[PDB]
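Archive entry. Fields below.
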Amino acid sequence: AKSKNHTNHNQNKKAHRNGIKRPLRKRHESTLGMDVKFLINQRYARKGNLSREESVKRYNERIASQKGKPKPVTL
Amino acid sequence: TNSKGYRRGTRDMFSRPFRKHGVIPLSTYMRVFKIGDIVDIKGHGAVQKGLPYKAYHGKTGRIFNVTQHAVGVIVNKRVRGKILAKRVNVRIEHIHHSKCREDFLRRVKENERLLKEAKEKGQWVSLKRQPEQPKKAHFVKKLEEPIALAPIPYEFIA
Amino acid sequence: GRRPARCYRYCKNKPYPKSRFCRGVPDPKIRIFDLGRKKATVEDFPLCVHLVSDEYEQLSSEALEAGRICCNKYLVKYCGKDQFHIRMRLHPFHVIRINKMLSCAGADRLQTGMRGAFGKPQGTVARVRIGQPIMSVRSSDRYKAQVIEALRRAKFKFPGRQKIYVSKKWGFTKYERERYEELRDDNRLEPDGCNVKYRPEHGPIAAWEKAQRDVYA
Amino acid sequence: MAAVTKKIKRDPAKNPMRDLHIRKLCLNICVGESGDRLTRAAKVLEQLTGQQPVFSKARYTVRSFGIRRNEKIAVHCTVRGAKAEEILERGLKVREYELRRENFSSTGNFGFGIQEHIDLGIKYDPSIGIYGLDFYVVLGRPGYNVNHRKRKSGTVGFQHRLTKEDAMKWFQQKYDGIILNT
Amino acid sequence: KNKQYFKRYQVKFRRRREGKTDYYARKRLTFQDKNKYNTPKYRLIVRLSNKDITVQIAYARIEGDRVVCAAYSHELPKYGIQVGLTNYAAAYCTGLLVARRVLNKLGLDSLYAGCTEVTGEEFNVEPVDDGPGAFRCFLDVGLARTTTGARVFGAMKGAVDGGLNIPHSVKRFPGYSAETKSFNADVHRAHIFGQHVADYMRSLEEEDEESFKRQFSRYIKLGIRADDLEDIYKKAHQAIRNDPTHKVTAKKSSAVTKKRWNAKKLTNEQRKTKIAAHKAAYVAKLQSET
RNA sequence: GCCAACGACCAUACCACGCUGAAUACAUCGGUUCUCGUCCGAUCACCGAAAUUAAGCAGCGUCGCGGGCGGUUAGUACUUAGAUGGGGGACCGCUUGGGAACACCGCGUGUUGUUGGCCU
RNA sequence: GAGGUGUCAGAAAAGUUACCAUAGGGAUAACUGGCUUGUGGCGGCCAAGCGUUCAUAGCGACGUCGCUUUUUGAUCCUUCGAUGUCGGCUCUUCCUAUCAUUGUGAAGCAAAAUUCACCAAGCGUUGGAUUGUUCACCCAUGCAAGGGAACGUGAGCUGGGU
RNA sequence: UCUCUCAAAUAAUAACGGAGGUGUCCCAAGGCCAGCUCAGUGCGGACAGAAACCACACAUAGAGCAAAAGGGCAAAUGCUG
RNA sequence: AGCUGGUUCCUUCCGAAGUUUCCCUCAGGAUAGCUGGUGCAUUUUAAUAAAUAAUCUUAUCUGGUAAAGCGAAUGAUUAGAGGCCUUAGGGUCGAAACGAUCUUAACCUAUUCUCAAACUUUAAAUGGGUAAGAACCUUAACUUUCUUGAUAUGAAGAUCAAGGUUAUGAUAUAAAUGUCCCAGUGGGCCACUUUUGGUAAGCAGAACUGGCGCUGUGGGAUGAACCAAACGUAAUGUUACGUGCCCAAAUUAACAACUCAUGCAGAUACCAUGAAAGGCGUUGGUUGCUUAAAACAGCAGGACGGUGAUCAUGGAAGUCGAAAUCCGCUAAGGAGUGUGUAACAACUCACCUGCCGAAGCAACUAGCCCUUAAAAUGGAUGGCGCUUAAGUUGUAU
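PREDICTED_STRUCTURE:
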């Protein structure tokens, strides 16, 4: 009683009716498969940042007193 | 009933084409892959670890993970029927930077030059790309002699 | 004995070679594709006259046999055996398949109805294109009509309208009837077996020295 | 084949350091069975050079030659420098300095086959039973390193390259050997 | 053989045709962790050439490998070693040359002064606590022979003792008794200071004096006998620390001709005319022959 | 220019046959205490004293062998789209777009990154 | 973690029903019709040969193109809340691809006779033995005992085969 | 369940379509490294012939990697320690 | 009872699917997809863009089909020619020869013939991914018990400052989003194109797309599906398909050909059939001829001799057949195109002439017609009928 196995007939009509629908360029950035560590010190990054105009100004004042780093980039 | 395994029809997908034969030469790694860069996935079948499953060959994604010896590329792949997003961990031996992105970047720098040049010329900018319009009042001078010659044909000959 | 060739007249299917997958194919009924004084230097028989197919159809090995046999007999009988090179430029490397209706002894049980209808190999066919040359026949300029008459009678043995074209080409060599005279009345062509060797320039000095000396000697 | 060649006005073009040293003389005793006969065959090589012979296993089961795979059919020793010269000369006498023009390969190397190894020294010692010897002498050019070497592997030569003629000339010179055509 | 074979021959890379690089060792050595993005990995590459010991620190880039420091044993007559620039001793010195010259341009001189007393003891240089961690350099032997007692490794011991953090198990340094392991530390020292070179002198100076007349001359001509070799190599180690000479060239420079020398490639006008002249001569030979 | 080391791209770098290679040099190429590895100090380990650019390697030549690229071949082949176009059908003209391949011909026969040296 | 259900996303399971029963099914066989036409039957094309000679009077290889749908398969569209199997009896009309008869053209047709082909179905194409038999096989006569279509024809029979 | 093809060059893609295989095999045929160079051919080597072992030259994968088939590989993924 | 049958008023608006997966599943469900409804959040995609969604284009990737190839790997294969080599196996001249010379074979070389779905270096078209900016780019600097490094770099989070025009094109019927876990569907059918099995089928099965299913109307005479077109109700206007009449409509106030059909002359895609092969019917083409020293048809007239030259003798002087095949005489006549006496012989045609004194002859191409082409209740371009068409081709209103 040979039925019929497999037609992809009307599937592509079906899809465009209520759009196959692309999601989002999330400014609010999704994660998974980031090697756990980055995530740990990403958490710390956010926390330690506490806010900020004085914090940046004090460490700029450290960099001018120290100057600092001719060695790091070459190594 | 059907096809189904993973390597179905990949005789020519994973074929190293004549005179490109062997060990994947080191430049491939030397390219620094950075999160958010557009990457094209090209199946290299000599590097058998981190193989991009056959639907993903010439389907191109943006990088959302860099892991110790894999680059996790989000390819958006058309399902029947709701575009689900897949993070595929694939190696750099199969992952080549798309210079689709560079065309954009080249444009920013060029647009800024044209903007500056025009502003210093006072007026006018018009930096947006217009496709090839039906052109111009064309004068042909003989020079080098009038035209004419018509054509053809005796095209018999079996 | 093998249906009749309407069933295989048309190029319907993905061409089946005599392959390591087809193993079992009956021997092509065509053995000898070249009958003639094949051993004659190209300068002796300056004509070529062709039967060229004007149809996308398949000519059977069976048909090909008959057309060869016709061409041999007319040329040999009227105008003496060794005055012609008959080359049949169509080899039959495509396999005809027939699914015989195996019910034997009206006894059925397992038959095979359409289920599975796998064609077993029965026959060989040459696949033919518009302006594909069937026949090429070499002769000396006084034997034009006799060649043509032999070709006319070969046509009928084959399905679907073929026409005779007298090529402005010197024999089986590419060279239009001016061109081998330009070359062989200089120093430039030297003899190969039903063919001619080049006229090279490539390559280079060492080869050129010898060629020029051989003609002059 | 087609050159602006010259042979430029340098002066004479002799034959300097590349002169012809002997790579190895390798002796083999080929005995169709392993066991005791193979061990006895080993005694013949081992005493002659003093250097212990290494064995190599049967590639395959030929069966027509009644051998099975990895049977350890036969033993061989390679001999280089000083001891190579002495042993080669000794077996040369046994062969007669009359070789053949073929014995010679295009890599300019030459072989003998001899029966009675006892002719070159070795006491009859009847428990060991008389074994024939295969001689293959590979002639090289001093500093053969290039085509052998693991790092910086290069493919030999124009001139260098040992030919049949080069090897026959060397044979004709020292040993005064008659090339002798059958 | 045959026109035909040449066509389908997919002949090896370029350096596999020169047999210098197998490329398989090269994959493993270069191939960075991708999650270390733009970091220049640090390879110490040792090749033993039969009168240079050339040790270079190299990294890969997409344009080509970039070398930061290069030391040649032909630098060692500055530091007083005129002779045996093929040596074990000269390897340990060339390894110290790279190591120290690496620490000189890259400012790591005061910290990580590497094994100063050179007692040949099995030390990889320990990271200094609350200091940023010292240069991790990886051995590219390439196809260079993974051989116990090699100068390849004699260079590596000297590079470690030059302050560099080169991970190595101790087996491939010279003097290691295989049955058991069992690191003979005296033997290790002796290779550094060319004592073995000196032993080669001392024993045969009584007996077979053919070998002096040949090998280990220049040691006659400079009055440096056997016991004196030990001091030159110990005081070469001190002299290398003191000074990084760097080497400067003032030349200018002729790409063109001088003298012969690249035989200016025969214009198409020249080739064709010459080719015709050959065919012309061949016709002339046949006319004489007749 | 050359040479070295380290390389990228990956046969313009190969192959074949000659010729040539000065200098800092690779190489050719020697010695065998020691370490070390080999049946064999051929390789491999070490010592670097005597020779040599013939070879490797490099360059130079070659109407070569091969390899690249463009045209030519060819808008053809082939094909998307169209007709109440043709043909008995097999298939085929036209019309709107896109567009090969072998072949033949020409021209090239490694280029270049870092770092050091040599410079005819 | 393992032990397993292969109907392998996982029932625990033997026959027979012509003594049968039900709910359905033309999603499905048998059967009419339709498509197809390999297979069957009929007719050509070319023509190597047969035929004293002479390819085609009559024939015709190897090949090749059809037509018919009356062979048999292939199919399942229609029909399973039923379309009355096969033959034989009886009775109908037509069709030719014409065996006889008419009028004709061929002949290796001398006569006689038969064969081939044509216009032609107007008109014949039978009586029996056996078989249920179409078919078949035989006997006898007559110049001649051509072949098909409406699976004709079971509120016509018979119910013999199935 | 899987390979190649059908499958109309992304992918998806069926018929009792075509050529086949799977229920196991293996402490290496896993894992890693070092060394090596194979299919095949040419040329030498008593016993050795076409094929035995020995020796050199060539050789893009034509071999070998349990198995089906198709991919992949040459100082290996193969082979040998 | 998963089965069959039936299910009771209307209108309005929107409006399917026969597919996916799993299931003793396959006459059925669940499930996903398609469907409606209920709404919700925001409209520079909103009420008096520098934010997109998704289609072209552009830019940037992929691919092994069509084609091509085999003197490219793999897999098949044909032809000669030329050859080393003792690799020859025979022979001839040789006692024999790795002697000379033929002969034939493996290889080897350059050509050459022909092919692949389960071959492919090569390699399309048409396809399929991503991008075309304020959610962007660039400058500058903060966290890093990490990853990581002699870098509190990089990598992210990210703070701060710089920027002419927002950085292809049309559009948005507003779009996105959630709930119902909603029905209905899980039996498809047909056509262009592409295709597999099968000779094929109104056959079994895919790929893409549209219909039909759920779709009348106009048109194809007719008709589920083809064409044109998607239908609230009407007037008036104009189209597709047609236009002798039937049947709305020019037997055109246009036009040039072709065709005359005794048994489906012919008469609109799908389509209701027609070939292979023939035709001095007719019609237009192509190419080659004879020839003014008179040709081409057609008569008249020679068609012999060297010589039954001769072999087949069964009989052949020219002629069942043939090696062959040249002179002579010549204006020209084949050691012969046939008729055939079994032979001789008598006839024929070539060849050249008298007349013909200027036309014609052969081989091809393809239209319509004719032949091929015959079947069955009476019969079908749908009908009448149509023949300088109302046919067939092309063309104009």
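CURATOR_NOTE: The beta strands of chain D are 21-30, 54-56, 74-79, 110-114, 133-140.
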